[model samples]
Target chain A: ATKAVCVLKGDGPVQGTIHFEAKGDTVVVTGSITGLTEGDHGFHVHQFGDNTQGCTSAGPHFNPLSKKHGGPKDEERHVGDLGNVTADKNGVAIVDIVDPLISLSGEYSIIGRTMVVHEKPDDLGRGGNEESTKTGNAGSRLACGVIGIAK
Target chain B: ATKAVCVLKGDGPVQGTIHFEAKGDTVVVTGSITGLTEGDHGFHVHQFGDNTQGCTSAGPHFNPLSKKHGGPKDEERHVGDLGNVTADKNGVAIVDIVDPLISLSGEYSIIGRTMVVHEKPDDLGRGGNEESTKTGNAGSRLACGVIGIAK
Candidate 1:
């Protein structure tokens, strides 16, 4: 199985290490992240690893298949739309997710891209706003990291 | 001034954030890194942001100028050769370096490259071994992160 990892950081106290492991047709995402408000935050794989413009230059969500923004289990969601991660009162999130739409190789490979955590929860493309279909109206970027080969 | 940051991680406890800022003909490199042996570790910018082969695919030291390996103070070192970072007994390295040969723009741009910390001290090409001139005999890759544009 193929694997990958990311070390996340930002101007704030946000810090964490995210791990991705491929098994069968799915990827298992796990990590321990700290420094966030007690709520859900949008998480996604962006198109570029270019942090030159902070997280903004990472570009839009990694949607090579030309799909609309949606949740992880949606049938027509962008490849990057991993949905939200919830934090607790002490500002920590123990991430445990199993996704079938992402990959480590082939046309949907996510290697070398940037992973961004947003400041607010994703509306799951149902917010009814123009931005909903594009970004799920996810707010500002809180932290980011690049996905690299693990072994 | 232009800037960038990298979040480094490995299978070991190594984790840290490396920041870079352009200042005149030089760049200021600073950060506080932990999880290291009580000694010096070779540090450099590699050619690619790829982690498809762990740190190996990051490629050789970012030597766009085609120069021999040397010290950070040497006039003929690879542009990515920032030399070594020493760790304290607690395995922490408080980095503070001013580099004149690296850049954030133009041809020497390191925007999408990888930053690597090695397992051994960089001999700066002074070692007589053939590998010395190539990789300073730096042991294994301890940790790595991609250099991204920072706003």
Candidate 2:
């Protein structure tokens, strides 16, 4: 299967599966999250392809287009930054989202971007602070993955 | 050079690096961190051999031995639970620890395991709850990466 490796830098342990497909101008991401606490977690697409030590080092959200740091719903933010994923009490989070800005067939696809999970809920811009202005009030760092096209 | 990719899965962005070396009975890990709002973050080593999506789906800490959940200092926890990584306003952190039960030549070798970053800081038993006991109060899923021998 087409896959990308995920690494947890610090504590605990977890595992899961992911699937992706692209049609026209949009790409759909689908997957199951397992081996984690049941609750809400923040999820996003970052701007870097390097996974050196942990996801944190990947740098800010992916904005090759140089958009602002906001949610997918925001027209001024990067094409990445899809927002959060909710996990049931069983710690299973299923993700499904579509982005017209990303392409799976072209050289500009998300093949080199990073996907990350946070330990808290994203405030969706309702929170305060400059950081919140873009990503809402989400907090903490958690799990992460990178976007790669199927070979 | 051989390298491992990590994904950050937390609220805010995190900046850190993983330092690892295979020597004797342990894999020595050391590094610096940043990007956090001054607090502790949960950390661990996951089990897997893929990075298709970066580290989001690598799933759980490396516990081939099936140990309990605790810090690296804990004798009963999984060898992958390296405990919390602290960050300051500068959002930097440092990691330095040894896994005596793990070796470069053993099944526990992190050659393919993914590492993750979390959103919340691990309480390290200071938090009063069952989740705290199993997860050390480390909140949120953050970034992730794969463990591999440096060339």
Candidate 3:
């Protein structure tokens, strides 16, 4: 089985880590993060894994499939769209999820990509805003981490 | 044959994920973190594996052997005194170290204990401070993560 870990980075009080443990065709992802406001925050995988200029250097979402911005449950969505993580009163968000579209190896590999969390909530394309269909209206970038193969 | 993972917590940029791969009597810990000065920062294993009040709840060093504060290579050092992690020109640190005194089972087990990183460099108990013999006067707790059994 292949495993990967991502170290998150961002301005202000936004930080955390994401762990991936592949099981068959699905990769079970479980982890937590802190320093977020109490609400639904946008989460996705960006194209670049570099954090030299913070999260900006991560560039756009990892949408090699050229899909629109949508929730993880959407039939037609960006390969990077994984949905939101809810934070509690103290800005702590616990994540335990499984992604069927992402893989550690082969065509849909997410290794060397940047997994990001946003400042605003991901409307999942339900919002009528123009940016919603393009970027899921997740708002500003809050934190991000690099996904790499585990030892 | 077992692996372990932990999510570190701390104020500011003190964040990262630690991956522990079991290797016979020792576990190889590998991790990547950001937000630190361009120098050596103290690292250790705290007694309690907790993050309620940040890293403060992690308690003291993991000294089941009743050893005092010293370097990781010292024969009379605390099991928790894993020494310092130096950052590069950027505020990032990648941890890849093997600890022989820790384990997944038995009395010296580190599972459920908290791994901590400090703001200042550990003097290796040679610093002329009152707490030097106990904590190496490692300053404040910058970040921490709880060690747990992994897949």
Candidate 4:
């Protein structure tokens, strides 16, 4: 299976690692993150891998389709949206997800992009606020890392 | 200048991103790390970029010359020995280092390798123990990331 991985970090104490493995048409995401408060956090793919100015330099969510922000399974959601990840009492999040929409190569390939974790839970664009449709009001970029080829 | 970068993450809360830029015979390392206690931490380059088993799978220090573990400027030190980075009370470390022994695209290049941050300060082989000579007794692999090409 083709695979990719990212090691996330920001200006704060938030940090983690994520792995992506391709299996047929689906990608299995698994990894662990730490230094978070207890609750959910926004997670998605950003348009760029550049961190020259930290998270701000990564640009916006990878919205190649120009769709509105929504849940991971929503038809109107941006291709970068992958919903949320929850953390435990110890501030660690263990991730295990299977996504069929993202691909390792071809038109949907995410190489050289980035994986970002936000400070707050993604509202899935259901918050009814203007920012909700654009960023899900997920708060600051807590941690992020560039996705790269893996063995 | 030729450049590379690494986003660091581990099984724990320790994480960050580091960048490498080549300037003639020297390489400048810069970035910020979070989730560390207020103190010094061991930082270095590992032999492999594989993190399939986390940091252990990355192998030992990049010692192509069969040298002993020592300070970054020591003549007998491993090429990967970058010494340490100190964290502030806020658990943040701002990195700014200039190394002369490493390169970007040559026999001493560090591309496709792994960068590691240890749980404790590296002894630089001066701890007077068996593990010191091998690992500098730097404790656990708090965070790690694979170094990759950058624009």
Candidate 5:
């Protein structure tokens, strides 16, 4: 099983790691997000891989398709819209989801992308608001981690 | 006048940057090492800049002088010998020193060399022990950063 992992970092100790396990065309995303306040948070695979400027330099979502930001099930949505992750009272969130739009190889590859954890919950373009069409109003960025190849 | 710089990264949050500022035939070393425990620690300019297999892969000290380990002021000493750095309680160490043996561009260049931090204080071969003549028994390396050219 091909795999990729990223060690998320930020100002505070509130960090996490997201694993991308490849199986044929789709990739299985198994992640453990710890050290955040208890609640749902926006999660995404951002465009750039450069961490020199930290989370701010990760740019926008992994939207090679240049489509709108929507849920993971949206056909015409941006490839990066993987929806949300919620944290428990112990400041930990665990999820296992299979994404067909995201890939580890080819022109649509996410090899050098970054994972961003937002300060607010993503509305998944279901709020019926204009901001929902752009960002789902996911609030500010809290942490970021670069995605890279794993053995 | 030519100068060089290296951004050092190892296994953890302990990161450092080594500067090689050229002034005529001499190169001045200015450094800042952070994320360390408060104490005196061993320092050296290692043979290679490779940290691919960890600091242990950087090889030994930069021995262009073909001499034993001695203090920085010693005449018969290894070219890489720079003595020790003591960290504060907040895990920060800063230093600025002019070295005649080090050069930015020359045959005995330290351009591609690495600066290593040991787990213990370097005895400077004054311990009178057999290991002192070899390594001062400074223990394992805690961190390492490669020296390089700066703009």
Candidate 6:
């Protein structure tokens, strides 16, 4: 079977490691983050996998399901919309989730997708406004990386 | 043989995608970003796998060796330090790197981690005061997501 690994690079001296484990029709992720302040940050999976130019180059969220931009709990959310992440005083974040639409052998594989970080927290549209439509009040781009298969 | 995958989430809409392939001890990440402004951004891997807690919860960079913070090309840098990603007006960033310290079958796998995006560009210590020790001048966190395994 084919597997991919995704890495996150941000403005702070932080680093995030991700493991994409594909089982049949589901994609399971496991990993951790370091070097950050204690707080909440917006998080999600973008549609494109291009980071050659920069974070902006990665483009928008991966809404293959054509869902609206909202929190993960939102029924009309984008397929790539993952909500927000909370960090402790030590600046650490751990991630664990499964996506039914993605798979190692499926077309939704994240091998060609980009991962990004926001400066502020994602209000999940609770804040209201156009910013919520594109970023959910998460603020600016901090870091980015492309998803790749493990050797 | 376990496999993994990474995902990227950024601002605006998606412009393009990149491709990365892993083979044993080597990881090849390649992709392009579109619809972005010209600038640089700090990029790295976070420690945690949970985005619900926030970016700070991601923890520090994945530096098993506990090396000092430095660029991706730095020989004695942290294991999670992948360096800076640049973007043009069109917004495009490509990545290609190989490392013997990372693996999909070991504890250093790239799963459960969060990928981030910064608002400003990464000065690489050339623009910041304190030599950009704490943060790489990559600016605020814009977007993020957890890395998952693809079947």
Could you estimate the TM-score for every candidate?
Answer: 0.60, 0.47, 0.52, 0.56, 0.55, 0.49
Isolated chain A TM-score, each model: 0.97, 0.80, 0.95, 0.97, 0.94, 0.86
Question: On residues A68-117, what C-alpha lDDT tens digit does candidate 4 reach at each position?
Answer: 99988899898888999999999999988888777665657665567899
Question: B1-151 in candidate 1: lDDT tens per residue?
Answer: 1777777777799878888888777889999789999899999988766654567778888887899888899888899899999999999988899988888766776766789999999999899988888888887888887776444
Model 4: colliding residue pairs: none
lDDT of 4 at B50: 62
| Residue B47 in candidate 5, Cα distance off native in Å | 21
For candidate 6, write residues A1-151 as lDDT tens digits.
3555666786567678777777666777777767756798887777665444566666787766775687877776776777777778889878776765555544454555677767778888667688787778787777766665453
Q: Clashes per prediction? A: 2, 98, 1, 0, 1, 123
Residue B106, candidate 6: alpha-carbon lDDT: 52
Candidate 1 lDDT:
0.83
TM-score of model 6 vs. true structure: 0.49
Model 1 lDDT per residue over A13-107, tens place: 88777888898999999997899999999999988765545677788999989999999989989999999999999999999999998887666
Instruction: Please list the residue runs of candidate 3 whose C-alpha ends up more than 4 Å from where it truly belongs after superposition.
Output: B1-151
lDDT of 2 by residue, B23-138 (tens): 66556777775676677778776665455544444565677777667767767787678777777666777777676765544355554455666667766644677876666766
TM-score of chain B alone in model 4:
0.96
Output the lDDT of residue B20, model 3. 76
lDDT of 2 by residue, A82-124 (tens): 7777888878888787777655434444544566777777766
lDDT of candidate 5 at residue B88, scale 0 to 100:
92
Query: Which candidate achieves the best TM-score against the true structure?
Result: 1
Sliding window of 10 residues with minimal summed lDDT for model 4 chain A: A104-113
TM-score of chain B of each: 0.96, 0.79, 0.94, 0.96, 0.91, 0.74
Comparing 5 and 6 on DockQ, the stronger one = 5
- The TM-score, computed over Cα atoms with residue i paired to residue i, of candidate 4 is 0.56
